[PDB]
């Protein structure tokens, strides 16, 4: 009887504890379940996930192995596959999310064989006992990456079942699959890493790796990435690994503070008088604010499914601080546009950019959207690609009065934080 390897947000063969744990015991068959709880999302994200599942199947086939893909609720389909295959047990990487725990609990109940869950590779795990709200103390627990696990060589023969739907992303996807991811990683470490510290705050994000869409789906292990960067070493290297660690900090935060999906981490802000306003929400959402930087960011996001960190923090903070828009709606609309959209990481980013309690980032830091563009888009090349409407970073009939909006937020936030 084979062992089932159930891939979720780990669509790869390299550094995959569940895959190896299973293969060491006997023949394996891989499984992906196309779960409506994750797939009732935007076309771009459905297609990014589907095409990486397709790539993983190709990877299994190229090694002579079998990847099943079934559609439906995991607690129906996983036991289905285990019965049809006569599997002895199912292996998967632990998910520490509320839905991960719910789903895996229901799967374990419905399976008449063990579900063996192994820790996913991390730089630091999300579920350490100590809760940290601040990145520095959390980051000090990291002492360098453990070595990643090899991929299998050839995989054991088995029967393949199930179809992988072809869906329209509506935009150009990156090349899916771990072969493309690993090529991307090795090029970045070679060419860009040396100046990463000096170039990671560009509005165009061209100093960075552009690997988040692979990290989000586990197509690339963060442990392997951290290990490879550390073997490279030099100055870029420490700073880039620090950013990998921000990803793990985000999982840590949502794990210890699950209620931050509902309300600010900082309790002083839980009564902030946000101002719902359909028109303003839409102006922001569609990048029609009259603020060049913000409009460029949101138009790039709509068209591509990616945005640099420096653009994300400007676009997100503008909504929260300059527009006073309810953050939850904005957060969710933002995640749905992102190929790398990842609930914990996006929540972290929004609560950080919004001055809502992450990393004790102070309320009083308010981006000046013309200075931000001046500092992070040299000859204005980025503004020109994405909103050439605008001759400069100067706001052009902005949907709000920018200085008043600034003064208004700071007044409100000064009352709240210091009262
Ligand atoms: C408002 C806001 C929302 C965000 N939403 C998401 C999201 O849903 N999914 C997502 O993957 N990232 C999100 N980010 C984090 C970050 O901006 C992206 O991961 C980054 O832009 C990816 O570009 P890159 O791969 O070139 O990063 P690099 O600079 O090359 O960094 C390497 C990797 O480290 C991680 N990383 C880098 N910066 C951060 C960060 N600020 N926080 C957490 N991890 C980080 C990512 O996994 C990234 O691929 C958000 C940031 C903000 C401020
Ligand atoms: O196991 C799945 N994971 C999917 N995930 C990956 C996870 O959400 C996965 O369940 C883990 O994130 C939790 O173990 C997706 C992620 C996206 O960004 C977009 C689409 C999906 C779709 C699925 C899916 O159908 N099945
Ligand atoms: Cl979603
Ligand atoms: Cl177990
Ligand atoms: Cl190891």
From Swiss-Prot:
Keywords from the UniProt entry: Chromophore, DNA damage, DNA repair, DNA-binding, FAD, Flavoprotein, Lyase, Nucleotide-binding, Plasmid
Site (Electron transfer via tryptophanyl radical) location in chain: 274, 327, 350
Domain Photolyase/cryptochrome alpha/beta intervals: 1-123
Catalytic activity line of the entry: cyclobutadipyrimidine (in DNA) = 2 pyrimidine residues (in DNA)
Entry-linked InterPro entries: Crypto/Photolyase_FAD-like_sf, Crypto/Photolyase_N_sf, Cryptochr/Photolyase_FAD-bd, Cryptochrome/DNA_photolyase_1, DNA_photolyase_1_CS_C, DNA_photolyase_N, Rossmann-like_a/b/a_fold
Positions of FAD binding: 196, 208-212, 240, 247, 309, 340-342
Positions of the UniProt region annotated as Interaction with DNA: 243-250, 309-310
Region ranges (Disordered): 146-175
Annotated DNA binding sites: 200, 372
Enzyme superclass (EC): lyase
SUPFAM superfamilies in UniProt: Cryptochrome/photolyase FAD-binding domain, Cryptochrome/photolyase, N-terminal domain
GO biological processes: DNA repair; response to light stimulus
Biased composition range(s): Basic and acidic residues: 158-169
Protein name as annotated: Deoxyribodipyrimidine photo-lyase
Protein source organism: Thermus thermophilus (strain ATCC 27634 / DSM 579 / HB8)
Lineage, top ranks: Bacteria, Thermotogati, Deinococcota, Deinococci, Thermales
